[PDB]
Scaffold this active site. Structure first.
Site, short mmCIF file in Angstrom:
data_model
loop_
_atom_site.label_atom_id
_atom_site.label_comp_id
_atom_site.label_asym_id
_atom_site.label_seq_id
_atom_site.Cartn_x
_atom_site.Cartn_y
_atom_site.Cartn_z
N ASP A 91 -18.44 -45.88 -11.05
CA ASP A 91 -18.26 -44.79 -12.02
C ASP A 91 -19.42 -43.79 -11.96
OD1 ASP A 91 -17.82 -43.07 -14.18
OD2 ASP A 91 -17.43 -44.66 -15.64
N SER A 92 -19.11 -42.58 -11.51
CA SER A 92 -20.09 -41.50 -11.38
C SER A 92 -20.51 -40.91 -12.73
CB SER A 92 -19.55 -40.39 -10.46
OG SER A 92 -18.19 -40.09 -10.76
#
Ligand SMILES: Cc1cccc(C)c1OCC(=O)N[C@@H](Cc1ccccc1)[C@H](O)C(=O)N1CSC(C)(C)[C@H]1C(=O)N[C@H]1c2ccccc2C[C@H]1O
Ligand SMILES: Cc1cccc(C)c1OCC(=O)N[C@@H](Cc1ccccc1)[C@H](O)C(=O)N1CSC(C)(C)[C@H]1C(=O)N[C@H]1c2ccccc2C[C@H]1O
EC number: 3.4.23.39
Lengths: 326, 326
Positions: free
Chosen positions: B213-214
């Site tokens: 998850d960026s």
């Protein structure tokens, strides 16, 4: 003596307490908020995920409920909230009077503050002209009903943090403070707000509008004013999220002066700095934040109220200040 | 070569970038989110205070707009957001294809993240089964339209923080990484998620569901797991708001191991600690947070992605990992 309510600490703001609505005395956790003028409570009809684990108000189970039903829809960027007005018994200790409050039907946002703490709603203690519905303040209503002798209240917050605080109604309780109790004239009957001259470093602002707010854990200062203060005060910006940070024993940081024509109110570095460490600790967090509310507006929150016992006088339109005991 | 988009840094999450909608190429600031699967944008009809200073999409000003108008109302405790679907040109660099997105009509909450930063909306890059409307992912559509050769993309984040990052579409760009590029099988085609065995101290969890998850600036770990980790790791809880804190040169803290049947992925204290001081500094902030998403779920955010260059391969249902260059 005078009626109390213990103030419980939550997100480092010390002004949460219990009050009761209805003839059957339904309890509610409240933020007692000197900077707003309505009381808000979750209704039984509230179908919002947020209300789910809060206390609700059921008008059908209190004999003294009076229908009102004026709608309300307060909306900010922060969240939206909507409900209806109701009249019922609102009770703090021995004190009870029919009051109009807002049953919350729908509430979205205000995360994570709201759903994560255990506060149910807010109990305003500000001035009539700041309310929705233009409704006399609770304490003022208490007086009109011959339940208390003076529409006055005080907030005590312990100099030594860990302890509980007190909201007192109808009189000044001598035990809470030392020395003389100084009064200041409100510049408006809105929030509890006063004209002062404020000096930090050589940076100062004359005839500042300064606001007493219990819901604030911090000291507020106009952006321009804050930048001047920090620049060449050897305070350091760093973060993920603000702060800022300095040495605890930093003998550069100035005393905060709030002067009225009579008395000067001071805050020492010791009182506006917060220990970050347990191993160490030379290292401290600055409890002053840049916030622009209104042309020339400062907020005094807990850090200040923890030194000064404060009296809120509806009768004389003044705020009282004294050095807190214990 | 391959198509880029600069990743800009906002609240210490580095995955904000620009894409364009319509034939007239209206620009928008986007959170490129690998953990969601729609693209959201403020409509011109949005009357919410929050939309006020964002970029809007005006369907009447693009020749290639196709009416859809399927309604959507996504609602959490955090905020509510509602709008309609539209089909138009969605463009990143040289790449353009009609895509269905969500024009936001009303948006309340998500404060202060949203209105304070300058992001307009989010551009999902997850899997079909995670979307509203069951809509093939943008990059997958790009492939179907013979615009790119592989439905693949990569995210590079600079080891040394200050710099810019890159989202690359349709190929693997050799310059971004060192050594071999290892692949791992997705355990589900939802988010980009993989089965790994995770060891911190002697505390460990086998066959953990770990999610890339960026939009996360942090490393996530189940509550039970986190408590074990911190207990007798000489890390200290203190705060107003979480943290936690430790010595920067603390030779107690373990290496974080994420093992697959082929390769072990490591995170050194240097890569999961954050300097708090400028004067000093022996003092550090721990970038690992207790969060319970789903039975046995860990999130790898920026701290991890700043060491490892990551490849997202729609064709093979795999995630690539390599040590980042520069
Ligand atoms: C939340 C809520 C529930 C029921 C009913 C109402 C009306 C509620 O308020 C919604 C609202 O419009 N609140 C106003 C304040 C207000 C209330 C009533 C009338 C007019 C204005 C404003 O947006 C706001 O949230 N503020 C202004 S200053 C502030 C930073 C102290 C903050 C606050 O309240 N709390 C702070 C706080 C306190 C303790 C711990 C953490 C935090 C974070 C921060 O959120
Ligand atoms: C904000 C927004 C605008 C327009 C349109 C949409 C869909 C938006 O997403 C709201 C939403 O439902 N976000 C969902 C993710 C989502 C998006 C779309 C569809 C389905 C789910 C999630 O609950 C969420 O907010 N998360 C997941 S974890 C998280 C804490 C990182 C957080 C987040 O996104 N951001 C964090 C962050 C990042 C940088 C700085 C500050 C903060 C605070 C925190 O909010």
């Amino acid at each position: 003596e005078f009626d109390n309510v213990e103030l419980k600490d939550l997100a480092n703001v010390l002004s949460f307490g219990e009050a009761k609505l209805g003839d059957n005395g339904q309890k509610f956790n409240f933020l007692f908020h000197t900077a707003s003028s309505n009381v808000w409570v979750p209704s039984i009809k509230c179908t919002s995920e947020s209300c789910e684990s809060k206390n609700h108000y059921d008008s059908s189970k209190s004999k003294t409920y009076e229908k009102d039903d004026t709608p309300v829809k307060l909306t900010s960027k922060a969240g939206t909230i909507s409900g209806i007005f109701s009249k019922d018994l609102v009770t703090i200790g021995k004190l009870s009077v029919p009051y109009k409050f807002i049953e919350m039907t729908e509430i979205v946002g205000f995360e994570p503050f709201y759903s994560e703490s255990d506060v149910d709603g807010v109990f305003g203690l500000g001035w009539k002209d700041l309310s929705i519905g233009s409704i006399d303040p609770y304490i003022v209503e208490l007086k009109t009903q011959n339940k208390i002798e003076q529409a006055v209240y005080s907030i005590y917050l312990p100099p030594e943090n860990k302890n509980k605080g007190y909201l007192t109604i109808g009189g000044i309780e001598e035990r809470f403070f030392d020395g003389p109790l100084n009064y200041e004239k409100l510049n408006h009957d809105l929030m509890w707000q006063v004209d002062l001259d404020v000096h930090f470093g050589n940076v100062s602002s004359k005839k500042a509008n300064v606001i007493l707010d219990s819901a604030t854990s911090v000291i507020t200062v106009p952006t321009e004013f804050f930048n001047q203060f920090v620049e060449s005060a050897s305070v350091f910006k760093v973060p993920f999220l603000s702060l800022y940070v300095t040495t605890c024993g930093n003998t550069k940081l100035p005393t905060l002066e709030y002067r009225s024509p009579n008395k000067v109110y001071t805050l020492e570095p010791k009182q506006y700095l917060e220990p970050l460490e347990n191993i160490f600790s030379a290292l401290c967090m600055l409890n002053i934040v840049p916030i622009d509310l209104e042309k020339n507006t400062f907020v005094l929150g807990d850090p200040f109220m923890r030194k000064y016992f404060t009296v809120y006088d509806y009768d004389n339109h003044t705020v009282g200040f004294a050095l807190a005991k214990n």
